[PDB]
Structure formats: C-alpha cells, structure tokens
Design a protein around this ligand. Sequence first.
Ligand SMILES: Nc1ncnc2[nH]cnc12
Length: 297
Amino acid sequence: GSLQLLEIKARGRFGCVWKAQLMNDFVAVKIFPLQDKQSWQSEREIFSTPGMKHENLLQFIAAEKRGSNLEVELWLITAFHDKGSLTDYLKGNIITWNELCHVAETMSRGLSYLHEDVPWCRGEGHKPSIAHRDFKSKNVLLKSDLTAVLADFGLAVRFEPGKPPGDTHGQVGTRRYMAPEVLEGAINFQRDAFLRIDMYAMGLVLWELVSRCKAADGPVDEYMLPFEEEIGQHPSLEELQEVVVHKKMRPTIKDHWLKHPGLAQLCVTIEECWDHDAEARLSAGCVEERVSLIRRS
Ligand SMILES: Nc1ncnc2[nH]cnc12
C-alpha cells in the first residue's frame, strides 16, 4: 500500500479507527479483528448500496481482506474528517447559534436521507430506506465547516423487499440512546418502526447540541452525555428502564434556554422527537425542514 497508518483516532465498537496516509492525503482506516468479520461485511454492504454517495454520509473508499488464516485483518477505508466527532467536539467547544443550526440541519438532512427510499439513483439503482440502529453524537463526524457526516453503519439495516438481511437482533444500540420500545424489547421489523427508533436518538443528539450552544444569555454548562446526569455514563438496561420507561424522564431542558426564540422552538422539536409514543415522533425530513425555518425566524 501507500496506505500508511499514523495514529489511533477512535476506538469504535467492533473495530478501531486509525488516522492513515494515502497518497498525498489522509484516509480513516477501521480495523476489525477477524472475529468481527461480520461487522466489516455488514458495514461494507451498507456502503455499497446504490445512492450512498451523499454529502452528509461518510464516504467509502475501499474494503481490504488483508490476508489468509489467523493473519487476516479486515480493513475498511473511508474519508478522514480531521475535526472528528460531534461528541468530542461538544466536549471541547461551545458552539454559535449559526453552527448549531448548521450541524442540526445537515445532521437531519444526512439522517432523512439515510431513511429515504429512492426508487432509482442513476448508474447505480435502487436505494432502500436504511435504519442506522446506533445513532449518537459519536457517530456524527464533522467537516472543516461543521457539516455533519453520519458514520458507523455496522448495525444499519436496509428495508428492501426481496434482498433480506443477515441476523438482525432487537437490542443492538448504545443503551443511553435506546427508545422505550427498545429497552422493553418490543420491536416490529418494520421500516417506520426502526426509523422512529433512530428519531428518539437524534432527539437526544439535538439536546446535546442545544446544551453546549451560546444561548444569547446564561452561562453554558460543561458537556454531559444524555442521562449521564440522572444515572451514569453507563449503568444498565435496568436503570434506563426505570428512568426512561417507567418514570418517563429525559435530559433537562433548562428554563433560561426557553428565553431564546430559536432554542425554544428547537426544544419543542426535541420533545416531539423523544416522545414515549413512537407514532408521535417526527421524521428526520420534518426535523430538517423545521431547523431550516427556525434559522429563518
Ligand atoms: N472516527 C473518525 N474520526 C475522524 N475521521 C473519520 N473518518 C472516518 N471515521 C472517522
């Protein structure tokens, strides 16, 4: 190769992302140990679906089966986004209202577009809807200009009559971002149903953005993960089930945030996104449109 590995950037779930050098540029190389072949094959099949060339989805370069028995590593080469992920960005920066609006609209744009069935993409073919299945601020990367890029499709599932998937399990996502349906183990293998599970998680990602924005007044608090403040960064299926399902709670929307006309309307939108009733949640496309028209306020 002229592929030259440089440094570890992210420790992913089933794989590990290296900054790497290719030709005169950088590329991200995710390395799967050989027991995670089926995450590498899942993830490469998603990237290989028609119409996945899109400004707000991570871009695919190559998948390499580096060898034969017991030596085999599985490499997946995508574009490298130096600015990194949204969660670490939020960890170290407080963002402007224009930046929030831009990351919110491009992030819902890339999600609505993942979610979208496109009868035909020229030279390529049918793009079915795709549910992410692990949507979170770790999995939203950021361009130089803060444009959102969705990443990490190792759990994504296509809704394509006739091309079925492999083993698809019920509770596969990061626990903190799990819709109550999911926590309770109750999930129809239907497109609308999975989409709405993604939308509950984008709701919490929106919250995270709002929580580190300069909100024309009060001080801005240090970044926390959804529910890190209520239970832990981690604690289990059982505590989330209390706080999220039984007691009905969500990350606090601060009173003083409501005195900004933009943030007031974005929080209304968040609350519809993370509604207990799955059927009451907005689609990604309706969030993209909302965000656009709030910017315009
Ligand atoms: N985790 C990551 N951080 C930065 N750039 C990436 N490009 C692909 N994955 C990436």
